[PDB]
Amino acid sequence: EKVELTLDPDTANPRLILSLDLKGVRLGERAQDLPNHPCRFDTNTRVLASCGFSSGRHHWEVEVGSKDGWAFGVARESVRRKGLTPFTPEEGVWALQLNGGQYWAVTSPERSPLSCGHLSRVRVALDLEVGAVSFYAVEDMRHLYTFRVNFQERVFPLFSVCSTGTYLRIWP
Numbered sequence: 294e295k296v297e298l299t300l301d302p303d304t305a306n307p308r309l310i311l312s313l314d315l316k317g318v319r320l321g322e323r324a325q326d327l328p329n330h331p332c333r334f335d336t337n338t339r340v341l342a343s344c345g346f347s348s349g350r351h352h353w354e355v356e357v358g359s360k361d362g363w364a365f366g367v368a369r370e371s372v373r374r375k376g377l378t379p380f381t382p383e384e385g386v387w388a389l390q391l392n393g394g395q396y397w398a399v400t401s402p403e404r405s406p407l408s409c410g411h412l413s414r415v416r417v418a419l420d421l422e423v424g425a426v427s428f429y430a431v432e433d434m435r436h437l438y439t440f441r442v443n444f445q446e447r448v449f450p451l452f453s454v455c456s457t458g459t460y461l462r463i464w465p
């Protein structure tokens with residue numbers, strides 16, 4: 294069930310910078326001049342993994358920056374790439390987020406504050422049989438949050454970074 298992911302550069306918003314190893318994402322100062330690939334998020338600061346899941350159970354781990362500005366989890370493949378989307382379950386993203394110095398599950402219309410400790414590394418567990426996306430703090434595999442979803446399509450690991458001082462990294 295453990296998966297080895299890499300970030301898909303064709304999906305990445307042109308302001309993002311992906312590390313050479315395709316495991317890390319940060320936000321650059323300027324938009325790169327990149328082609329208008331159909332998979333590319335052209336406005337929101339997102340990138341997907343190159344691999345998505347249609348069935349079964351899979352998990353991966355994400356190292357998280359201490360500073361505000363990231364969100365990560367999963368997106369349905371049909372998430373709109375072109376134009377400005379809301380970052381919400383209805384628009385096809387199921388994510389945890391750090392901002393305002395607080396961790397959130399990005400529920401809508403109101404986000405859900407989590408009372409977890411400081412997070413360093415998070416396991417994401419996607420179960421398409423059960424219909425759930427779950428997040429655990431790695432150190433004691435402490436459950437943080439589950440979204441229950443009836444996924445009817447391929448689901449991709451999702452990352453977003455909208456501040457220059459933070460990052461996400463597929464671990465290790």
Ligand SMILES: NC(=O)CC[C@H](NC(=O)[C@H](Cc1ccccc1)N1Cc2ccccc2C1=O)C(=O)O
Binds near residue numbers: 379391392453454
């Ligand atoms: N990482 C998260 O916490 C998930 C939110 C994230 N937010 C965005 O993409 C927002 C969208 C927006 C918000 C307000 C006005 C206009 C556009 N952007 C785009 C942008 C470009 C360059 C510098 C920063 C930003 C930024 O904040 C997401 O939707 O993936």
